[PDB]
Write a protein that binds this ligand. Structure first.
Ligand SMILES: Nc1ncnc2c1ncn2[C@@H]1O[C@H](COP(=O)(O)OP(=O)(O)O)[C@@H](O)[C@H]1O
Ligand SMILES: [Mg+2]
Length: 620
């Protein structure tokens, strides 16, 4: 009668509900596509756990949370937001009606602040625990304590097959329940030579499959919105240049995508139409698209990671693990015996790719985690029950940065500023910038700038209209500052009644601005609860630069020459990006602060503001 009956989870329903009734903690193991995320909440609902309180399901990815909530509301024939809802960083889609709530790890973590026993919940499913996301690890540590205080709470840990076997031991020998899998052998093809231009080669491989191969959808693994949009654009360009090719529906998947773009990936195309899904590793384990027969794997993910040449974080593409590569290839083995095209050699796979991914807790900036856990009451991270504890090096770096920011006092204790920063689901320096903007008389402007820094870049630079795009970008430039340029673009977008037609005409991403407005509206509410006044600096934009100079003092740099600056904290060379508004100035300024470092050909500053030297002196 129902599509949801073809799912492997449906057959173990009774056996699994028996294991859950008998044990506080259960580990559920099954392949991506088993029905773990869509079906487990419904099993618990139908078995009466929703009587006493809410059934929560946490996972690392925003798009998975939003999308599965929609699917489950449809399966259950309820309005999304009613019996089935979701909560993500910048959207609460729930009501007093909500019994099944899908959320991101971060949202449940923040709920434990004011509700340490998570009293509203009868059950929690910690889904996609095999990714070992930072906040997943923080939640397992929290649950170790909660499960003592509360003997009624059911914890279900969900895992794909790999990196699944340590959860049981961590929760005192919790029972494991495996949903058996059905996977076709996948033909894994390695590139003959190393790939320079993985975007170009991805597109060549997409169109070779499209014109030559029998029916079956394509899944392309890229790294971010940026290489995804370029890939989609180049597929359309080359497709339109071919002679009478079959139709192709090209659909992106990236973390910040709006709900309307998410819904598109699950639509069946007209008959005779192939789909090409161009995704990040969202499409590795977190969600399934029916009918995939061909995978194209770039071999990379994009992460903010410690860079030795910099002595600080850099946003960079980095090789995946051999485990990630197996998972990516496996997406072409669900419908029939598919193919996986790896844009990298067997040699590169054996020598340049680690067997496993290191847990995020051991390779990521810990500043949000330190600040969060000090709120929750935890003085030192190594006091916390981490499955894999973070290294002292990274703890020390965060303790230092949070002290320099003013979030910790000289004894390393939480300050009032540090507490206020925890109210904002963003990098501590970015929260500090928003908090300080009240005293600088520019909270109105700063919440706009912070909103623009929280969403994908606004400037559209299509590849067959680059001089026209560059020209339009230059008329929005405030040459002293990329931060003011973003404020300028948003203010002009608003002045034109938030028009999508205006954005296209000026080479701006409406989705970016629409997302910036979503974030702004949520930040305004947090600012209200934190009793911040909304004040405008009027025509004095200099005080915005001075405030930015205060929030990003730790990333001040001095001109070296020919677009090169020296980071004052580390004495490392960083390059100004040629796209920077600062190239509209008569000459490059002596002093800047920047938002972040990006690795492309070399280490570039991204989002740069000119600062007066006397501003830096005043500060510490
Ligand atoms: N928005 C959605 N998010 C995730 N899966 C979805 C969504 N809509 C439909 N599905 C379908 O649900 C099925 C997989 O069930 P799911 O519970 O996601 O499994 P698992 O969590 O075990 O991977 C696939 O047919 C997939 O396309
Ligand atoms: Mg899932």
């Amino acid at each position: 009668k129902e599509q949801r009956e073809f799912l492997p989870a449906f057959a173990v329903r009774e056996d699994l509900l028996r294991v859950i009734r008998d044990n506080q903690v259960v580990i559920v193991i099954g392949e991506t596509g088993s029905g773990k995320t869509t079906q487990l909440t419904q099993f618990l609902y139908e078995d009466g756990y929703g009587k006493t309180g809410m059934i929560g399901c946490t996972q690392p990815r925003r798009v998975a949370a939003m999308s599965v909530a929609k699917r489950v509301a449809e399966e259950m024939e309820v309005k999304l937001g009613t019996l089935v809802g979701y909560a993500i960083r910048f959207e609460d889609c729930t009501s007093k009606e909500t019994v099944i709530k899908y959320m991101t790890d971060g949202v449940l973590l923040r709920e434990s602040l004011n509700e340490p026993d998570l009293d509203r919940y009868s059950c929690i499913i910690m889904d996609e625990a095999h990714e070992r996301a930072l906040n997943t690890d923080v939640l397992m540590g929290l649950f170790k304590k909660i499960l003592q205080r509360r003997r009624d709470l059911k914890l279900i840990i969900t895992s794909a097959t790999m990196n699944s076997k340590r959860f049981s031991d961590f929760f005192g020998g919790a029972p494991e329940f495996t949903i058996p899998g059905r996977t076709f052998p996948v033909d894994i093809l390695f590139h003959r030579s190393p790939v320079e231009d993985y975007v170009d080669q991805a597109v060549q491989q997409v169109l070779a499959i499209h014109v030559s191969k029998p029916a079956g959808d394509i899944l392309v693994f890229m790294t971010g919105q940026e290489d995804i949009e370029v890939t989609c654009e180049l597929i359309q360009e080359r497709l339109a240049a071919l002679n009478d090719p079959p139709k192709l529906s090209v659909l992106p998947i990236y973390s910040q995508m709006p709900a309307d773009l998410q819904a598109k990936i699950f639509d069946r195309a007209p008959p005779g139409v192939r789909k090409c899904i161009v995704a990040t590793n969202i499409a590795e384990t977190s969600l399934t698209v029916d009918g995939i027969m061909y995978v194209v794997d770039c071999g990379y993910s994009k992460l903010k990671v410690y860079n030795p040449r910099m002595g600080m974080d850099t946003l960079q593409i980095t090789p995946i693990s051999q485990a990630n590569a197996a998972q990516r290839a496996g997406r072409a083995g669900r419908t029939g015996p598919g193919q996986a095209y790896r844009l990298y050699t067997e040699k590169q796979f054996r020598d340049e790719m680690y067997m496993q991914t290191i847990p995020e807790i051991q390779r990521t900036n810990l500043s949000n985690t330190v600040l969060l856990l000090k709120s929750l009451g935890v003085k030192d991270l190594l006091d916390f029950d981490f499955m894999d504890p973070p290294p002292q090096d990274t703890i020390t770096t965060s303790l230092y940065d949070l002290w320099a920011l003013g979030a910790l006092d000289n004894l390393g204790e939480l300050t009032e500023l540090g507490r206020k920063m925890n109210a904002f689901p963003m990098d501590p320096p970015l929260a500090k910038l928003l908090i300080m903007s009240e005293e600088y008389g520019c909270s109105e402007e700063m919440v706009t700038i912070v909103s623009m820094l929280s969403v994908p870049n606004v400037f559209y630079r299509p590849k067959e209209r680059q001089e026209e795009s560059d020209a339009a970008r230059e008329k929005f430039f405030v040459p002293e500052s990329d931060h003011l340029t973003y404020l300028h673009v948003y203010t002009q977008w608003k002045a034109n009644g938030y028009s999508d037609a205006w954005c296209a005409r000026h080479f701006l991403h409406s989705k970016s601005l629409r997302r910036a407005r979503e974030v702004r509206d949520q930040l305004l509410d947090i600012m209200k609860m934190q009793h911040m006044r909304m004040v405008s600096c009027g025509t004095d934009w200099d005080i915005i630069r001075k405030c930015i100079c205060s929030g990003y003092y730790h990333q001040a740099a001095k001109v070296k020459g020919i677009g090169e600056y020296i980071n004052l904290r580390t004495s490392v060379t960083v390059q100004l990006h040629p796209t920077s508004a600062l190239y509209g100035l008569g000459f490059l300024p002596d002093y800047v602060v920047y938002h972040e470092l990006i690795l492309t050909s070399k280490e570039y500053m991204s989002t740069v503001t000119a600062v007066d030297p006397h501003w830096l002196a005043e500060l510490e």
